[PDB]
Structures are given as structure tokens and as C-alpha cells.
Amino acid sequence: QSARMTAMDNASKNASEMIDKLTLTFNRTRQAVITKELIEIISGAAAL
Amino acid sequence: VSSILEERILGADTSVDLEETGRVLSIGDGIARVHGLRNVQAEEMVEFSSGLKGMSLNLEPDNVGVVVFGNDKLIKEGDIVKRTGAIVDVPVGEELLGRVVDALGNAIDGKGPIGSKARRRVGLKAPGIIPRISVREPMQTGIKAVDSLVPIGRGQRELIIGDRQTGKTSIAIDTIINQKRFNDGTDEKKKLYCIYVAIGQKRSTVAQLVKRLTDADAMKYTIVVSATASDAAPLQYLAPYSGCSMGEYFRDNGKHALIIYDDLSKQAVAYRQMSLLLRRPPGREAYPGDVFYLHSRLLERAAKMNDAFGGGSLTALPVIETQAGDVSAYIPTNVISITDGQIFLETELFYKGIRPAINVGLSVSRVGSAAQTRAMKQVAGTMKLELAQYREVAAFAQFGSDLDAATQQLLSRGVRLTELLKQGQYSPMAIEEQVAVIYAGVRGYLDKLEPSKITKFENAFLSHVISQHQTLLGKIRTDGKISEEADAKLKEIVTNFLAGFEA
């Protein structure tokens, strides 16, 4: 029980770190998708 | 010399005639706004005075956008543009077989001119619901995985979708190299005339492709149609329609034909270049609207013909690459939506070890068991259901969720059939050896046999069956169904070979 508590503490910490990293790459992917869709709409309305 | 003399001086008519022309405005980047052609018809082959064709699209009241078939240095502002008088057309014959033909009709391989007879319009209308009949013939590829999970029908279209560098062109060339044994045989229904339209590739890949087909003796089904990278964007645009028109010639004569559209996304990007240079509004990912209509024409030019219309079939298989496996991109969603059969390669199984790298459950053939032989249907349906069970139980029991005897049975049979479906490059096998080896894999006799030893089992088993069991394989492939005496005989031979394998 002592070593299991230690292993689950360290696994929660590693999972929280990877949640933080994946949230950062989710946000930059979100911004890239918004900018891509925006450039497509603006390019369409300008080439019209 | 003298024959060359007389063919030069008799062949050209020099029959001058009054003809519609028009001068040229902006010759931008392969596009030419031509002022004057007030009787040109839409999408027509027209001819620039330096000897080079162009195709008239985008008829506007100002001017006509003719997009050139080739180089742009050879065109100035102010030169004539003569109407040829007809829609752009492809010269098709059966003497076009085994010869690399540049996208219009122009055989650029150094083996003389093409002996064509039947000119054909390239933008033709596909057949309707009455001239078509359903898939009946089993289009075999020689790949165990394709012919046992996603079989093709003579009468059908089926994608080869993946990411870059996965084995898609190699699957297409396995499909080509299988059909030699049906060409040199007896039945006309088995024989193959295929058209490999290489869109937007490099010339040395097409050259080494022709090397592999000539060394494998493929050049009587095959018609290689190369619109490479240095070719203009309308040659890359128009090349798979040319291969479709040649396939339609063979189909409407009544010969079972196919077309492999290698790198069909290059047609999509060449047509994107054409639309953005002809100033059409861009849609999504800067591809215009009618890219789906483009590929939809191109891919619905193929299904089995009626028994009163010759009986010839067409098998369209286009090869398409995604980027980072993104199936949700514009061209993969369009080309999945038009086709029905589709073979999915994910690539992590290519680096993990199965070849050809069909990563699988995404891949589906809607015609299913109708496009198999009777033996492969009798054997390989429980294999597909077992692989589905295996995939889902391994997916939740990645860590050892619950292991009874049933779960280790599922993982055992799943891993063993996974190593059954491995197959080397450029080695297609016939249907009867596939029925024999999937019989040795699914119907017991391999479930507890050390999964690293499956490949040597494959090699020694094929050596055994090709050694003293050729007439029995003849019975299997000619009788259709695997008969009950042949069933118990395959049981006895796989048991004897299990002894000789643990010998």
C-alpha cells in the first residue's frame, strides 16, 4: 500500500504534466484552425 | 530514307482553309486570355501557332481562358490561336498495349508511333442505371489481406488511401503483377488490360515502374500513362480522364479492364492550380467547388456492363495520400464519398511489421462476399469476425483487464492471423494457395505454434503445396467451391505438415 500510494502519486503528477502539454498544443492547434478558416474565407471574399 | 521522304511529303495535306482564330491577351502562367473566338465551344482543344495545344475553358464575354498543354516560353502576346474543331480526344486501340503514352496520346517512350485506330472523346458521359449491372467477377489482387478482407470486384471502384510512403503504389503493382496468370491463360473473362495513370509523379519512378513491369513481364495488360511533374498542369489534370477513356474503350468492347489512378491528389492540386490561375473563386483549402464533381465523373466512369452490352467491366482503383493521416481533409473526404471500396493503410503497422500495411477496420469493401470466390467466402468470413473480436479485446485488455481462456484464445488466434496476413513485396499468389493458407490458419492447426514461426510456416507450406499438390489446387480453383473431400484432404495435409513442421 505504501509503494502503490507512491506510484499513483507519481503517475498523477506525470499525467497532470502531460495534460498541461497537451492543453498547450490543443490551444495552438485551435488558433491555427481559426486562422486557416479565416484566411480561406477572406481569400474567397477577396478573389470574388 | 526514301520511305521517310514519301511519308513526309504525302502525309501532310497542306490543305489551307479559312479558319476561326483570335489574338491573345495576357499569357500569364500557362493561361491565355484569348480575344476573338466568338464561336468556340466550352472545353475545346484549340491550337497555338507554335504547334502546341491548349484547352479552352472559362468562356467569358471578354475572352476565353485557354490553358496550355505544355511550356509557356513558346507563346507571345498577339499570335493566332486556331480552333481545332472538336473536343479534346485520346487515340485508343489495342495496339496501344504495353507502351508508355504521354497524357494526350503521345507515346513518349522511344518505341515508334502508336498504331491507334479508335479516337475517343475524353469528357464522355458515364453509363446509366440500365447499362450497368452489379459486381460479379472476383477481382483478385494476389494480396492475402485484400483478397481475404477487402476483395475487389471486376465492376468496381476501390481506393488505396493512406499517408505517404506506406505501400500503396506497391499494392497497386501487386494487383498488376497478379493478373499475368489470367492473361496468359484461356478464358477471355479472366484476361486483363489495365491502365496505370501516374499523375504528377517523377519520371524516374515511372521508369523504374516500367522496369519492374517489364522484368515481371507485365506489358500486355499494362498501359502506363505518365503525366509527370515537369508536364503542365492540364496534362496532369487531363491524364486520368485519358486512362478512363481507354478503359471505357476496352469496357464497351467487352474486355475486363482496370485503371490504377496513382496519386490522384496530384490531379486535385493541378486542378487547383488551374482554377486559381483562371481566377475562379477558391473554396476550401483553396480547392474550388467542383473538385468533387471532377473526381465523381472520373470515378463513376466504372461499373459492370449489362450482358447485352458486351459484358465488359472496369475496375477503378485510385491511390490517394493524406497528410499526417488526416482523413478529414477536403480531397480525402470527397474521394471517400464518391468511391465505395476503400483500403486504408495506417503506417504504424508498416513500421510495426505487417506488410502490406493495411490498418484495417477503417477499410471496407461494400460489395463484400459477392466479389469473392466460393472457397474464400466459405473460409474467410469467420476470419474477419475473429479479427474484429481480437482488435476490440486487445484494445480494452492492453494491460491485462481479464484473461480467461477465451481472451487468450482471442489474442492467440488474432496474433496468428496477423502474421498470416504478412506478405512480401512484389510476390502475389493465386486464389487457391490463399484458400489453402487461410484454411491452415483459421481452421485450427496454427493456434498454439509460436507466432515468430509463422513466416517459415508460410514458406515451407507453399513449397509443400506447390511441390506435390498441383492437381488438387487445380481442383480447388476450377471447381469453385472447396469440396468436402478437398476439405478433409486439406485437413489431412495441414495435419501431416504440422507433423513435418514439428519434425
Added chain:
Amino acid sequence: SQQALVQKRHYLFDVQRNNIAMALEVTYRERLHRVYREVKNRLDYHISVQN
């Protein structure tokens, strides 16, 4: 059972006999294919030089 293994003693030596016969026949057929290959090479080289 040792009597039964005594009776079967004309199989191993037969395997050596037909192994040697198949090796020699394959070698003679390789002679045939090889000289076909080189005369093929000569005639195709002359044809390509003329072309």
C-alpha cells in the same frame, strides 16, 4: 520395430540419388539458359546499335 526399420533402409540412399540427379539436371539446364542469354545479348546489342 527394429525389423521394420531394417526394411525401410532404401529411402535415405534414394534421397541422395535423386538429389544428385536433380542437381545435375538443373546445372545442365542452367548451361542451356546461360548460352541462350549470351547469344540473346549479342543479337540485341547489334540491334540496339543499329537502332
Added chain:
Amino acid sequence: VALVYGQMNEPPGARARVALTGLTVAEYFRDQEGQDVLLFIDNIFRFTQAGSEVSALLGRIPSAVGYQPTLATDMGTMQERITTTKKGSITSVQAIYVPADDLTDPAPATTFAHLDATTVLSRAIAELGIYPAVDPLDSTSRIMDPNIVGSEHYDVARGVQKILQDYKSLQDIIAILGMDELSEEDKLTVSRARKIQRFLSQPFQVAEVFTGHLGKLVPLKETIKGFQQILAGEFDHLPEQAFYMVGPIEEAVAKADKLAE
């Protein structure tokens, strides 16, 4: 049956307006024929693709993801023409494509806004192996109310949806440690929900060539009794593959007897 068929390789004016041709024929069979008529429109996403292609070429600014700005208005016209009126009764089953399983595409979202009882046909439950890979956890119904259908049918439907929705979070609990620590009752409801989800599969008569099984017909009361009998605790001992490709509960009994002895 009256068939109106526009092929997938026609220009977008012929691939948008052919749905409207089917609407016009089925309106005449509803307006002044005086007949209960049903219309099967497969597959209204070519309508929106055709509209997006002409709107690229007509000279209109591209909207959100790349479709026309007149998406909701045009599909509102051609989906409010197709409804039952006081003159006649018309029921419309619509096979509606979504691109690469993306339900947040605006044309499937507005199509959701026009329906009465949808049915999601996912893929993930066919990666499992259940066909068609039907999501009822994303499916809707205007018809499902305790006065319309009943209290028995409604309560067994909400019980099946409750035990399948709980099976997802419980399965994500399983996915790290396994079947060891859930509980007695937690492992029991995981196996019960998995057994229900295998019982949702049903062999179609038209699909006797994909799986080989002949295919059966199941009435409503038999479905209510079968799911109420799986929720009632009668079949906690039979394996999950006994319920896989069956019709009534008697077929599951017969397949369990075939697998056992």
C-alpha cells in the same frame, strides 16, 4: 414505389434539384391523391455539396467551413416542404452523409435541427463489430414520451441508455487498472451493459451476404420484453456472444444452448 434517381456524377444543378424532384412526386402522392406516402431520400449531403459548388462558382462569399451562406435557408425550404399536412400523411426517411464522422459540420447540424427522430450510425461500434454501428446515445426521438409509447417501453429505453452511458466512464475506469477493482455491482453492471450492447445487433434480411446469417424480424413487444429481461437480471450468466447476432430472446437462448451443448 416511384423512383427518382440523379447520379453522383452530374453537375450540381442536377444533384441539388433531384431531391426537390422526389419531393414534388411525393407531394403529389400526398396532396391530391389522398394516400399515406413515404419518401426515402438517400443521401442529403450531395444537396449541400452541390450548393457549395455552385456558390463557389455563382459569385457568393464562402460562409463557415466552406459551404454556401444560404445553407440553412435553402435546406429549410427543401426540408419544410417535406412534412405531413392535414390533407395527407407523408413520412420521410433520409439517409444523410456526414464527412468523416464530423457531426459539428454545419450542414449535419442544421439537418439535426430539421428532423423528428434521428439515428446516429457511428463507425466505432463496428470497429467493435456491431452492425450498423448505431449510436442511440446520440440518437433522438420526438415520439419517445411516456404517454405516446408507454411507461414500460420508455423506462426500459431509459434504462438501456442509462446503463450504456455509465459503461463509458466505467470502461475508462477499467482502461487503466482492469477488471480487478471495480466492485461486485460495478463489474456486474459492466457485464450487463456489454451484454445489452451485444444484444443491440440484429441480422438484417437484406444483409444476409455480409455476415451469412439469414436475418430475422423482431416485433416491438418482444424487444421490450428482451431488454426488460436483460435489465431484470435473468441472463447474468450467459456469455456475451450468445446475444450477439440474434432476434428475439428465444434466439439468444438457442444460441447459448448451441455454444454450451
Added chain:
Amino acid sequence: VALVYGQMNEPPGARARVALTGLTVAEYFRDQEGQDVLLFIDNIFRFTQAGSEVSALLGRIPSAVGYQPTLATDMGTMQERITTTKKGSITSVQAIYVPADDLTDPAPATTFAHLDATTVLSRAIAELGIYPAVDPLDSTSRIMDPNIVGSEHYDVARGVQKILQDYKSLQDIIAILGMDELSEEDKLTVSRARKIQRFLSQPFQVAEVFTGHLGKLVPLKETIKGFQQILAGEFDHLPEQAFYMVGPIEEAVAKADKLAEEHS
């Protein structure tokens, strides 16, 4: 060696025509002299990017991500002229920048289409410390074929790629849980994989200023023998620190012996 330089200080019209310059020099040395030339073109994304800058000024409609519509065919003509022909041989090594590490960008994607041997000199494997940080999975070559490179080289290469793909799946599991959730098969795969992944790294001659080691020139048969021994698993006792910046496998055995002796 002849030299052509159109370096990054140049206006975009100049940089859009440097590959053409050095390429027609090397195309002279192929055609009308018959030599076996090398063509070292760094960095062909600068060619494509100068094309995009000019085309944004040329009034053409912007294509996808921000490039020109003529990305496939301008680079198409320029890459099709870089070819080995009957008249002579070109071996052309060309460095191809990727913008912001996107391999889905249109210019690197079409350049993957136009090549015979790719090498994905990644960055994350340099975060791990391996130099060059060649992603070897996404790197392939057209010439790897058992009817060309032999059966031994092919089996060793595909085994190395198999062990590294299994290590990628297992490093997902390791990054969440840890290495105390793996079996003996999984841990032997992880250990052999880290040994192989360190042994791919070698010190170069030109990068002797950054590291400390001299330039190691590893022959072919020693590469096959070293990776074949590590793959077959004869080195289940050496540390993974002994395979880093090594070269030949005898240098790895000697580094492990010298590590044990300096700990002695």
C-alpha cells in the same frame, strides 16, 4: 567543386533562380562532359519561399497555407531537371527546410513526393540528445529492397524499425504509468530499443567542435554487425550510456569496459 551562392540577403527574384543556376552548371557537367557529378543544394524551401514572395507580389490568387498556386509545377520543373540520365550521373543531396516543423506544409509535402531517399532530421530526438536527430521511421529510401541491399541488411533494418515502433507505443504507456507496468517481453523491447536508439548516433568529423569525440567513419558491414548484435540481444548487460556517440560496436564494448574501469 563549383560554387553558386544566392544567400538569404538577396531579394526574392534572385533566390528564386539560384537552384536553376547551380543546376544548369551541374547539368552541363552531366551532359556535355559525361561525369558523375554531386549536386549539394541547400535549402530548397528557400527557392519555394522566394517563389511565394514573388507570387504574392505577382498578383496571383493565394493557394493553400499562403503559397502560390504554382507550387507543384515550378518545383516540378526544377526537380525534374535534377535527374540522373543516360548521358551521366547526378547524385544530388539537397537540404529542404520545413517551416515550423510542419511536414504537412505544401512545399515539404511535394518535396517528399519528388525524392528517392528522405531523411527526417528531426528535433525531438535532439531534445533527447541524439545528433543528428534523424527520425528514422519517417526516413525511408527507395533502394531498400531485399533484391538490392541483400537479405541481412534488410532484416536488420526492419528489425530496428520494428523495435523502435514498439518502443513508441510502449513510451506512450511509460509516459503515463511508468516502466513498472511492463512485462519481460516489453522491458526487453524497451531496453533493446534505447540501446539501438543511442547506437544510431555517431560523432561526425565536422561537428567535433560541439562534442568531444573525433570523426567516426563507420563502414557498412560494421553497421550491420553492430545493429545485428544489439537486435539479436547479445548486449543485455551493457548500459545504454555506453552506446552514445560511439561509432563501431567495438567502441561501444570498449566504452562500457572503460566505464566499468573508471568506476573501478
Added chain:
Amino acid sequence: KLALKTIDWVAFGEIIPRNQKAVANSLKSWNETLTSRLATLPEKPPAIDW
């Protein structure tokens, strides 16, 4: 010009000593490979036309 006598390869396993079992494996696998090498070759190409 071949004289072939095929046996069932079970008595080939029943007939060998422990001393030459590895060499019998080598001769068996080499004979299997050589029979396959025979089977891959057709008898002769046609004569070169003139």
C-alpha cells in the same frame, strides 16, 4: 533426363541416427530448396529465330 523417386519423408525421419541428424536436416532442407529450384525452371526457351 531425370530419374525421380519421391518418398513420404516420414521414414526419412525414422531412419536417421543422432550422429547425422543435423546433416540430415541440412540435406533435407537443401533437397527441398533444390526441388523448388527445379520447379521454378521451365524446360527450355525456344530456339533463336534467324
Added chain:
Amino acid sequence: QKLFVDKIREYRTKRQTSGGPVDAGPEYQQDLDRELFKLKQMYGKADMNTFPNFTFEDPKFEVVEKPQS
């Protein structure tokens, strides 16, 4: 029939100029030598007449023996 009969006449004049390929220059023979050199590469260093057959090899399979069965 204006131009092509003049071209016919010049086909005669190039045809009458036999005794070697017309007005060739040295780079003609240089291109001949490079193409002939690649053609020398595609077979080796053999002769254009009196072809050789093979080098007579000998398949030597070692005699299997045994002490005692």
C-alpha cells in the same frame, strides 16, 4: 504545290550526298562515342563476333557418411 516539291528536291540533294553522314563535324562522332561507350557499359568487354558459351563449372555435393545406424 509550291513548297513541298522544293523540299522534295532538297531531300534528293541530301540523299545524293552519300559517302558518309553529311557535314557532320567532330561532335557528331563525339556523341556517337559517348552513346557507344554507354552501350559498351551495358554488356561488358565482349566481341561482336564468335560469342563464347560459358565457363565450365562443376557441382560438387559432399558425400554424406555415418559411423553406424
